[PDB]
Amino acid sequence: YFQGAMTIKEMPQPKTFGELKNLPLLNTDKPVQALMKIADELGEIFKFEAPGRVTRYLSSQRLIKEACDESRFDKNLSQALKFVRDFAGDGLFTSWTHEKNWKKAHNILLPSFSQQAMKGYHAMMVDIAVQLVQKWERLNADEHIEVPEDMTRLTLDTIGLCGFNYRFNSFYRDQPHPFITSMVRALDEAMNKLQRANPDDPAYDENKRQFQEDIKVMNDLVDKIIADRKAQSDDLLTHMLNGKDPETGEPLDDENIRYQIITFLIAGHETTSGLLSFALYFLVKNPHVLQKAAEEAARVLVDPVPSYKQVKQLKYVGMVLNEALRLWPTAPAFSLYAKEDTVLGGEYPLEKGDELMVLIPQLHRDKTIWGDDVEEFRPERFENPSAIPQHAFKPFGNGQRACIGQQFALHEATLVLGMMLKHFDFEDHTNYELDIKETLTLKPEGFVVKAKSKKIPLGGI
Numbered sequence: 001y002f003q004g005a006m007t008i009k010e011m012p013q014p015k016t017f018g019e020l021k022n023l024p025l026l027n028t029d030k031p032v033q034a035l036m037k038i039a040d041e042l043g044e045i046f047k048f049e050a051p052g053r054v055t056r057y058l059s060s061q062r063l064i065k066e067a068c069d070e071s072r073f074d075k076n077l078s079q080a081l082k083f084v085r086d087f088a089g090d091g092l093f094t095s096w097t098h099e100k101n102w103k104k105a106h107n108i109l110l111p112s113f114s115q116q117a118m119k120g121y122h123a124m125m126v127d128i129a130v131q132l133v134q135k136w137e138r139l140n141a142d143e144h145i146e147v148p149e150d151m152t153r154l155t156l157d158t159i160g161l162c163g164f165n166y167r168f169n170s171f172y173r174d175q176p177h178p179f180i181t182s183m184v185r186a187l188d189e190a191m192n193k194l195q196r197a198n199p200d201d202p203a204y205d206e207n208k209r210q211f212q213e214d215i216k217v218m219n220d221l222v223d224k225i226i227a228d229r230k231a232q233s234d235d236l237l238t239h240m241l242n243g244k245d246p247e248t249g250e251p252l253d254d255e256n257i258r259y260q261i262i263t264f265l266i267a268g269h270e271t272t273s274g275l276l277s278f279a280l281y282f283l284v285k286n287p288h289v290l291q292k293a294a295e296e297a298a299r300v301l302v303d304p305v306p307s308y309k310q311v312k313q314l315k316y317v318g319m320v321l322n323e324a325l326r327l328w329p330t331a332p333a334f335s336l337y338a339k340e341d342t343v344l345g346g347e348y349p350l351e352k353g354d355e356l357m358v359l360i361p362q363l364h365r366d367k368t369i370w371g372d373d374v375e376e377f378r379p380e381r382f383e384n385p386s387a388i389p390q391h392a393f394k395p396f397g398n399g400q401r402a403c404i405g406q407q408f409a410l411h412e413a414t415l416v417l418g419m420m421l422k423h424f425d426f427e428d429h430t431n432y433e434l435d436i437k438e439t440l441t442l443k444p445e446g447f448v449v450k451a452k453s454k455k456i457p458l459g460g461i
């Protein structure tokens, strides 16, 4: 019998504008937030076209759980990732599943994220966490904290030290590390290119020039890391350099190693910085949640510095992080393509190769899954993990292409937020109005607070 969908209706789609299709609709520096509004209006699925391309944005758990079926759909590189691939090449994040270096690097680097490797990263994470705490302990009366800026100093340094035994020393710089400045500019350019109908017009030559320069800065730091490793440890970098793919019996080549380093420096800190920023934002806006989290930190972190086991015991702190990720997943979308012609949700036909975009913040506001208080920050929703439907919560992607650093990210973040809550009281002194800056990833912009030391001693790392 014919295998088409039983019933097929018009595919929702927002206003188009001639040959520019839907492109105009995202003439904004907050494209994900605009897509969320479109999803509110059009529902669980809508088509989005730009000259030369088309995709379908998914917002419901019903459809997304099917999209997460790896036998039917594989990771696709969204137009966004295609632009990032120009400088991150075939590193783990921007490689195709069937591209040679994906599986190869995957096999070689996965051990760097094993339970035993995490335990081994703990002392280094504490090293950078103590630097964060000491910075705040050392501020004068009239001073405040630029939250995302300081979370970025902590997360870059953490991945730098744990992964490459290299010290960026971000807390010794009063302006952002150069790498951060070029990285942000480079992601912002990738994002802005999404709305350029004619990317090749000479009007974008200065943009390209700057992009090249920012990629150069990032690559110069990579050389320094590599040279510094030549000038002992067993870390991510050690594995990149020596690990052999148990399937090919060979290590990664020099070209791919460089892309992996760029990849881990970016993916390994940016979204974690965003997460820590959103979680503090939500904590200062929900005083009672903050106190309950503070109480757990006080109760668990009874030592000068957190032990690995204690971090594992910060259960409520971990629920706070998961709730900050439900509301504002910092890598807001991931893309898939159909491996064969197929029908999604019994009613949306797709041809082999068709693309889907999982709009994670919308998936995380699916009322049929979370109830009607989706906009509220309530960590208790994560009280019992078992209760959450499969594929309902996906801030870290899906399947074999899921985030390889998920456990590293949540451990770092739990440790740090735990220590912050133990050592300081916080004040949203400016009644901060949430302003979400988008550079593909998401982060609060201008978020500032005042921290008042509880004056609890800190121990030697």
Ligand code: HEM
Pocket (backbone or CB within 6 Å): 075, 092, 093, 094, 106, 159, 263, 264, 267, 268, 269, 271, 272, 275, 329, 330, 331, 333, 334, 335, 394, 395, 396, 397, 398, 400, 401, 402, 403, 404, 405, 406, 408, 409, 410
């Ligand atoms: C809370 C912070 C983080 C979030 C929300 C996050 C989220 C994600 C998501 C959604 C993907 C899938 C992207 C796609 O399918 O297109 C992903 C992939 C990836 N992430 Fe993360 N991530 C975080 C932290 C990290 C950290 C700290 C590292 C590094 C140590 C990391 C390394 C990677 C890599 C290498 C991939 C590509 C994996 C593969 O396809 O083989 N992530 N992450």
Ligand SMILES: CCCCCCCCCCCCCCCC(=O)NCC(=O)O
Pocket (backbone or CB within 6 Å): 026, 031, 032, 050, 078, 079, 080, 084, 088, 093, 094, 194, 195, 262, 263, 266, 267, 330, 331, 332, 333, 334, 440, 441
């Ligand atoms: C090298 C590390 C990779 C770091 C890149 C991080 C990517 C994080 C997820 C990206 C989310 C993409 C959202 C794009 C949304 C959008 O603007 N779409 C509209 C369009 O395609 O014109």
